[PDB]
Amino acid sequence: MKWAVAHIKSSFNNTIITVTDITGAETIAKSSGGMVVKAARDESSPYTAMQMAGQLADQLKDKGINGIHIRVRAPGGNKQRSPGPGAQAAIRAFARAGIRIGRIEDVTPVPHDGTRPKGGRRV
Amino acid sequence: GWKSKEWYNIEAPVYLNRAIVGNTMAGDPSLLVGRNVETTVGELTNDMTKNNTKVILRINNVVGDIATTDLMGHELTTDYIRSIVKRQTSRIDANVDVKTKDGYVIRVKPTCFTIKRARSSQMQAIREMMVEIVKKRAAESDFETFMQEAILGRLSAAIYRQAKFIYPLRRVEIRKTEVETI
Amino acid sequence: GGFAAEVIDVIGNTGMHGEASQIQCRVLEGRDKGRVITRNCVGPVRIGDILMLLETSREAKKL
Amino acid sequence: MIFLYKIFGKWDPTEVEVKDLGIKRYVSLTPVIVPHSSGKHARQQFNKSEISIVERLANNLMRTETNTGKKQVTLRAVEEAFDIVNKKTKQNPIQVLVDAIANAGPREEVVRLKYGGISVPKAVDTAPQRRVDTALRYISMGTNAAAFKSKRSVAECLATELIGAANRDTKSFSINRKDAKERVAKAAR
Ligand SMILES: [Mg+2]
């Protein structure tokens, strides 16, 4: 019974995923949108997220881990705040890969009043 | 790379029945020194009721194949904290550092909620009594007993029964209990 | 795997100029039998068509 | 009574079983004495679900401009291709054709869906009637392309196309077009 935690940085342009142990100071598997898929336009797709979850599940099985919690985050703060579409797709692809999922937490770093939000309002 | 780095297990605080949490593998025995382990109250005592809070545990020394850990406080989850906050409920935030019987210093952030939009004066009174009651809990009870009341929820109900007179509190929690000293 | 599924009902249509439709087939041609997977099918879609997929894990979202 | 109908009086479609289980309920093995039923595809849609498949393959062979109104020559080419497939590739010939249709029929197709705020066609499942139509269309295209400008007859090139798309010969035009459309569907998943 080995427990791991997968970090999913889901954006509107990418959904990088890295898998660590409980302490988090050691990583096991990692794969971003462009790590396996060669199109930047399709790096944030749910199909790319399921491909990343599948290609991480076999490495997790090789390392000896069958269950991972999910710590999903958006960029957060002075950028995009809500989680992207790749989070639920990655977690469902992990659950369909055989890897059990327990707790899933949305841990996007939320600022109360952080630095100045870069934006153009209408543009 | 992967094969060379060996594996280690964990050991919970003694007051949490010296429980088991997980296994973390590192290259060397001293590499796990100073590594925070994030786990919930439910998993430490295999119960689904206390799941919205994640306890924070710090490695203190690797006793062979087992990594003993120190409970460095808890903190309520972001989603549950944002779920408790609603409309017409002036949440009385706060921050107090105290000294328990053992000499531990704990920066606790006890929070309050109200059934209606509480006035500012009642909020100040609730915050003052909350700070005083947390001070008396820390002074009159040691580290492990007071933190069992805090993490497990005795402190929140104590604040509810000691600070309900000035105004009807909808719900009280201790969202952050960051630990400073030993 | 090349699993399949049969069209049990037609939710409606989906697309801009009609095109395909929304169909909730029941996956009964693999190890994962007993799963109803929403999917889009282009053409004169009909109830009871044994539509065979190249991958049956994905499901088209809710319209 | 039903006097054990065979295609052109030679090939009975009763003793043939379909491979592609979805296409079995659409492609019809109904016995008819002649492949000139003269279907009724205006009362509703998919009126071909009850029509024969040899007739349908003979009327999708009139793709060419001069082929219009020429169902007789299409049936001639169909018969001689059936003879060639039975001779060089001895087997039930309509069974070989139904294997060819089930092998060269496009399982997946890509259709425009403007979701995500981008002009991108999405990869979708293909209907059984639509997939059968595209299989017959690509078979006709391969037959016409081989038979054009060639020393080999129309029915001979049709037999070559049927053998290519039936025994999974990778050289057939129908197989290459089906794989190309499926590749384009994979590109836009
Ligand atoms: Mg501007």
UniProtKB/Swiss-Prot annotation, chain A:
Gene3D superfamilies: Ribosomal protein S11. GO terms for cellular component: cytosolic small ribosomal subunit. GO terms for biological process: translation. The keyword Ribosomal protein applies. It comes from the Archaea. Keywords: Ribonucleoprotein, Ribosomal protein, RNA-binding, rRNA-binding. PROSITE patterns: RIBOSOMAL_S11. Pfam families: Ribosomal_S11 (PF00411). Located on the platform of the 30S subunit. This is Small ribosomal subunit protein uS11. The lineage of its organism: Archaea, Methanobacteriati, Methanobacteriota, Stenosarchaea group, Methanomicrobia.
Swiss-Prot record, chain B:
It comes from the Archaea. PROSITE patterns: RIBOSOMAL_S3AE (PS01191). GO terms for biological process: translation. Pfam families: Ribosomal_S3Ae. GO terms for molecular function: structural constituent of ribosome. The keyword Transferase does not apply. NCBIfam families: PRK04057.1. Belongs to the eukaryotic ribosomal protein eS1 family. This is Small ribosomal subunit protein eS1. It comes from Methanosarcina acetivorans (strain ATCC 35395 / DSM 2834 / JCM 12185 / C2A).
UniProtKB/Swiss-Prot annotation, chain C:
Coiled coil: none annotated. The keyword Iron-sulfur does not apply. Keywords: Ribonucleoprotein, Ribosomal protein. The keyword Methyltransferase does not apply. One of its GO terms (biological process) is maturation of SSU-rRNA. GO terms for molecular function: structural constituent of ribosome. GO terms for cellular component: cytosolic small ribosomal subunit. Belongs to the eukaryotic ribosomal protein eS28 family. This is Small ribosomal subunit protein eS28. The lineage of its organism: Archaea, Methanobacteriati, Methanobacteriota, Stenosarchaea group, Methanomicrobia. The gene is rps28e. The chain holds residues 11 to 73 of 76 of the full protein.
UniProtKB/Swiss-Prot annotation, chain D:
InterPro entries: Ribosomal_uS7, Ribosomal_uS7_arc, Ribosomal_uS7_dom, Ribosomal_uS7_dom_sf, Ribosomal_uS7_euk/arc. One of its GO terms (biological process) is ribosomal small subunit assembly. The keyword Cytoplasm does not apply. Keywords: Ribonucleoprotein, Ribosomal protein, RNA-binding, rRNA-binding. GO terms for molecular function: mRNA binding; rRNA binding; structural constituent of ribosome. Signal peptide: none annotated. Pfam families: Ribosomal_S7. GO terms for cellular component: cytosolic small ribosomal subunit; ribosome. Belongs to the universal ribosomal protein uS7 family. Part of the 30S ribosomal subunit. One of the primary rRNA binding proteins, it binds directly to 16S rRNA where it nucleates assembly of the head domain of the 30S subunit. Is located at the subunit interface close to the decoding center. PANTHER family: RIBOSOMAL PROTEIN S7. This is Small ribosomal subunit protein uS7. It comes from Methanosarcina acetivorans (strain ATCC 35395 / DSM 2834 / JCM 12185 / C2A). The gene is rps7.
